[PDB]
Design a protein around this ligand. Structure first.
Ligand SMILES: Cn1cc([C@@H]2O[C@H](CO)[C@@H](O)[C@H]2O)c(=O)[nH]c1=O
Lengths: 119, 121
C-alpha cells in the first residue's frame, strides 16, 4: 500500500492562478472517486518541510504527541470546494497564504505523515 | 542550441490529439528520424501543464540510476512508437500503440521541467 509519508507528499507537497486547485486536486488523485473537500499544498522544498520534524513539538489534534509546528511561516495554498461543486466536476477556490504548518512525524527516516493544520 | 525543455516538448508532447500511421508521420515530422531511426519514442496526449506538473509528483529512480525522475500519480493518454523489423533508415517504419499509463520523466533546471522521457508504467 501507499506509505503515509508518500501519501503526505502526494496530498500536500508542491515544491513548485484561480484554477491552481482545480488542476492540482485532480493531478494528485484527490478528485478520483469523490471531491476531497479541503486540502493544503505546501510550496517549500521537501527538505524544509521534513525539517519541521525537528522544530516545535506540539500536541496533535487527535491527542498524539508526535506533531511539530514550523518555526517559520511557509508559502501554502488552501484549496476548498466551492458551494456549487458537485462530483465529478470538482470545483475549488484557491487561496495563497504564508503560515506556519503543523505536521505529524513518524518513521525512519523521520518525516511528515499527516498535515494537522496551518496557523 | 535547442533547450533540453524544448527538445522534450518536440520529442514527447502531442496535446493536439492516433492512426495506424501516426508514428510514421510523427517520428518523421518531429525530426526523430533525421540521423537514424530512433528505436523507441513516446508521445504524451495531455496538456503541457499537466505533464510539467509531474516534476512535483512521485519521485522514483531513473533507469540510469539518477534520482531526478518522477512518476505521474494519474494515468495519461500516450502513444508508443516502436521501430518495426522491416524498417531501414532513412525510410523508418513504426508500430503505433495507444495506451493509458503512468509516465516517468526526468526533470532539471529552474524552472524544474521535464527534460527526458524515462518510461511508462
Ligand atoms: C522506454 N522508452 C524510451 C523512450 C525514448 O528512448 C530513449 C532511450 O534512451 C529515451 O531517452 C526516450 O527518449 C521513450 O520515449 N519511451 C519509452 O517508453
Amino acid at each position: 500500500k501507499e506509505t503515509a509519508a508518500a501519501k503526505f507528499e502526494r496530498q500536500h507537497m508542491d515544491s513548485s492562478s484561480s484554477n491552481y486547485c482545480n488542476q492540482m486536486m485532480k493531478s494528485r488523485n484527490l478528485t478520483k472517486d469523490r471531491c476531497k473537500p479541503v486540502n493544503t499544498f505546501v510550496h517549500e522544498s521537501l527538505a524544509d518541510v521534513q525539517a519541521v520534524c525537528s522544530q516545535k513539538n506540539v500536541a496533535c489534534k487527535n491527542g498524539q504527541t508526535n506533531c511539530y509546528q514550523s518555526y517559520s511561516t511557509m508559502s501554502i495554498t488552501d484549496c476548498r470546494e466551492t458551494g456549487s461543486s458537485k462530483y465529478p466536476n470538482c470545483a475549488y477556490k484557491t487561496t495563497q497564504a504564508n503560515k506556519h504548518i503543523i505536521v505529524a512525524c513518524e518513521g525512519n527516516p523521520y518525516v511528515p505523515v499527516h498535515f494537522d493544520a496551518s496557523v
